């Protein structure tokens, strides 16, 4: 059964790094695509990032272009590496694949012809080095 399993969230400080996973099950045609978008706090959706498992191509928003990083662990996983986290990266985070088209990707962040799963909640403020 095509699932999409995520986990990683939390409340770092600015500056901070994180990294979210999405495992990626029953998915057997060569063209999807995987990866985030993102839906911030008062804001329309917004892509992240994608990798196509064609050729294994990853795509980033321009917004996280330099300080964000897709892998893959051939178990199915696909881990987003998030690095000098801004406050404006706060948002709930949305593992998602699609038939080959990191649809997210375009402006509004919509994902078509395609899945999600279920949000993670990533933060990042200065109330993290409250812990």
């Known amino acids: 059964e095509v699932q999409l399993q995520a986990s990683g969230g939390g409340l770092v400080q600015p500056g901070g790094s994180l990294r979210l996973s999405c495992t990626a099950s029953?998915?057997?045609?060569?063209?999807?695509?995987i990866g985030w978008f993102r839906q911030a706090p008062g804001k329309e959706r917004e892509g992240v990032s994608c990798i196509t498992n064609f050729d294994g191509g990853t795509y980033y928003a321009d917004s996280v272009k330099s300080r964000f990083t897709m892998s893959r662990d051939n178990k199915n996983t696909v881990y987003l590496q998030m690095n000098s986290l801004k406050p404006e990266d706060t948002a709930v985070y949305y593992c998602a694949a699609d038939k080959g088209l990191c649809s997210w990707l375009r402006a509004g962040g919509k994902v078509t012809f395609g899945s999600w799963g279920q949000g993670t909640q990533v933060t990042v403020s200065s109330a993290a080095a409250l812990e």
């Open positions: 029953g998915f057997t045609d060569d063209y999807y695509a």
